[PDB]
Design an enzyme around this catalytic site. Structure first.
Site, PDB file in Angstrom:
ATOM      1  CB  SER A   1       0.899  -4.257  -2.834  1.00  0.00           C
ATOM      2  OG  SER A   1       1.334  -4.660  -1.548  1.00  0.00           O
TER       3      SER A   1
ATOM      4  CG  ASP B   1       1.816 -12.079  -1.993  1.00  0.00           C
ATOM      5  OD1 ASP B   1       2.355 -11.531  -1.008  1.00  0.00           O
ATOM      6  OD2 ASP B   1       1.269 -11.443  -2.904  1.00  0.00           O
TER       7      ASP B   1
ATOM      8  CG  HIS C   1       3.773  -8.781  -2.691  1.00  0.00           C
ATOM      9  ND1 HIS C   1       2.430  -9.006  -2.646  1.00  0.00           N
ATOM     10  CD2 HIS C   1       4.005  -7.465  -2.466  1.00  0.00           C
ATOM     11  CE1 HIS C   1       1.862  -7.824  -2.420  1.00  0.00           C
ATOM     12  NE2 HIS C   1       2.781  -6.868  -2.293  1.00  0.00           N
TER      13      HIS C   1
HETATM   14  O1  LIG Z   1       8.780  -3.333  -6.470  1.00  0.00           O
HETATM   15  C1  LIG Z   1       8.935  -3.905  -5.390  1.00  0.00           C
HETATM   16  C2  LIG Z   1       9.997  -4.963  -5.348  1.00  0.00           C
HETATM   17  C3  LIG Z   1      10.747  -5.380  -6.392  1.00  0.00           C
HETATM   18  C4  LIG Z   1      11.609  -6.427  -5.880  1.00  0.00           C
HETATM   19  C5  LIG Z   1      11.300  -6.580  -4.601  1.00  0.00           C
HETATM   20  O2  LIG Z   1      10.265  -5.737  -4.245  1.00  0.00           O
HETATM   21  N1  LIG Z   1       8.169  -3.607  -4.314  1.00  0.00           N
HETATM   22  C6  LIG Z   1       8.334  -4.116  -2.940  1.00  0.00           C
HETATM   23  C7  LIG Z   1       6.977  -4.423  -2.293  1.00  0.00           C
HETATM   24  N2  LIG Z   1       6.047  -3.288  -2.408  1.00  0.00           N
HETATM   25  C8  LIG Z   1       4.757  -3.538  -1.724  1.00  0.00           C
HETATM   26  C9  LIG Z   1       3.765  -2.380  -1.846  1.00  0.00           C
HETATM   27  C10 LIG Z   1       2.912  -2.494  -0.615  1.00  0.00           C
HETATM   28  O3  LIG Z   1       1.794  -2.018  -0.450  1.00  0.00           O
HETATM   29  N3  LIG Z   1       3.574  -3.256   0.285  1.00  0.00           N
HETATM   30  C11 LIG Z   1       3.036  -3.668   1.542  1.00  0.00           C
HETATM   31  C12 LIG Z   1       1.771  -4.249   1.593  1.00  0.00           C
HETATM   32  C13 LIG Z   1       1.243  -4.665   2.798  1.00  0.00           C
HETATM   33  C14 LIG Z   1       1.941  -4.492   3.989  1.00  0.00           C
HETATM   34  C15 LIG Z   1       1.357  -4.925   5.280  1.00  0.00           C
HETATM   35  C16 LIG Z   1       2.166  -5.163   6.387  1.00  0.00           C
HETATM   36  C17 LIG Z   1       1.631  -5.583   7.591  1.00  0.00           C
HETATM   37  C18 LIG Z   1       0.274  -5.718   7.685  1.00  0.00           C
HETATM   38  F1  LIG Z   1      -0.257  -6.114   8.876  1.00  0.00           F
HETATM   39  C19 LIG Z   1      -0.573  -5.438   6.647  1.00  0.00           C
HETATM   40  C20 LIG Z   1      -0.023  -5.045   5.441  1.00  0.00           C
HETATM   41  C21 LIG Z   1       3.210  -3.916   3.926  1.00  0.00           C
HETATM   42  C22 LIG Z   1       3.761  -3.518   2.720  1.00  0.00           C
HETATM   43  C23 LIG Z   1       4.882  -3.699  -0.206  1.00  0.00           C
HETATM   44  C24 LIG Z   1       5.870  -2.955  -3.831  1.00  0.00           C
HETATM   45  C25 LIG Z   1       7.184  -2.521  -4.425  1.00  0.00           C
END
Ligand SMILES: O=C(c1ccco1)N1CCN([C@@H]2CC(=O)N(c3ccc(-c4ccc(F)cc4)cc3)C2)CC1
Length: 295
Positions: free
Chosen positions: A122, A239, A269
């Protein structure tokens, strides 16, 4: 007689003197993790976590990599987990890349001659791409799990509309909604575990941090034509954050002679915290890919 000040502590009040750590270029302490084999390591691999999470979420994947006789290392990025910094605040996205490079450089001094790989998920995948692009020819390979290459068009629009206010006016507290974990894995047990971890940041994304994520997307886009590092790219078709179109764009635009894409049909994702069929496959494919590129 002058006296030394009270020991520096993590945001959870643990003295950094009791933990593995590194001090970055800005004087901030980053909490570190190491998983080393009993013998001489075949290679080093840095694990790069994403937004709102921390290095502890990669325990099982790191132990699998250590079982392949690689020395795995990680740190919590600034503003995350047990490292210092205002939670989910970064002066510029490049801080994350700079700090990964400092840790890699530090580790290559202690273990010279060894090849070094990157593994990112991510936002951590965008960091891994930028780290490799900054040092062409230096990394032996990169493993990307759903990297931030193209944001979900809906989430990109929301952040481009919220940036519109902050970039043209003074609004320091402006934020969007929090990271919705229920739409990021079909494995309900994993969603519950993520929601119970006190080291995860549950606050809504601050507009200034969303601006740095939009900067990361722009920088990754410019970096793609310059990427030559070998990579394994794992992406779910459902995703909601890192649009699958970005994985196809990365396969198309990178110049890497060794690039492979595996699509997980219907997966969300967080592929390494998905349904056991998907997560077992992810661990197996990373094991095969790294095993074939190490000796
Ligand atoms: O382990 C879990 C899990 C287990 C069960 C459910 O979730 N995770 C939840 C999700 N998380 C991501 C890490 C990260 O960089 N996130 C993210 C990416 C882009 C964005 C983004 C948002 C808006 C945008 F315009 C651009 C990028 C926001 C967040 C999230 C990793 C950890």
């Amino acid at each position: 007689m002058p006296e030394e000040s009270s020991p520096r502590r993590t945001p959870q009040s643990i003295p950094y003197q009791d933990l593995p750590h590194l001090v970055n270029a800005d004087g901030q302490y980053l909490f570190c993790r190491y998983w080393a084999p009993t013998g001489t390591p075949k290679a080093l691999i840095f694990v790069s976590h994403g937004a709102g999470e921390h290095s502890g979420r990669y325990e099982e994947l790191a132990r699998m990599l250590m079982g392949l006789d690689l020395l795995v290392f990680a740190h919590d990025h600034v503003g995350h987990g047990q490292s210092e910094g205002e939670r989910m605040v970064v002066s510029d996205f490049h801080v994350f890349v700079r700090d990964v490079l400092q840790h890699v450089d530090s580790m290559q001094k202690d273990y010279p001659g060894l090849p070094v790989f990157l593994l990112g998920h991510s936002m951590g995948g965008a960091i891994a791409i930028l780290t490799a692009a900054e040092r062409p020819g230096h990394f032996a390979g990169m493993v990307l799990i759903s990297p931030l290459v193209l944001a979900n068009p809906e989430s990109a629009t929301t952040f481009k509309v919220l940036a519109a206010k902050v970039l043209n006016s003074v609004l320091p507290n402006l934020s969007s909604g929090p990271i919705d974990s229920s739409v990021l894995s079909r494995n309900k047990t994993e969603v519950d575990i993520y929601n119970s971890d006190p080291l995860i940041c549950r606050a809504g994304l601050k507009v200034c941090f969303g601006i740095q994520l939009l900067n990361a997307v722009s920088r990754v886009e410019r970096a793609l034509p310059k990427l030559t590092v070998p990579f394994l790219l794992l992406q779910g078709s459902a995703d909601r954050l890192c649009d699958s179109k970005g994985a196809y764009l990365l396969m198309e635009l990178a110049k890497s002679q060794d690039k492979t894409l595996k699509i997980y049909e219907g997966a969300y994702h967080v592929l390494h915290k998905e349904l056991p069929e998907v997560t077992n496959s992810v661990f197996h494919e990373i094991n095969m890919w790294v095993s074939q590129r190490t000796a």
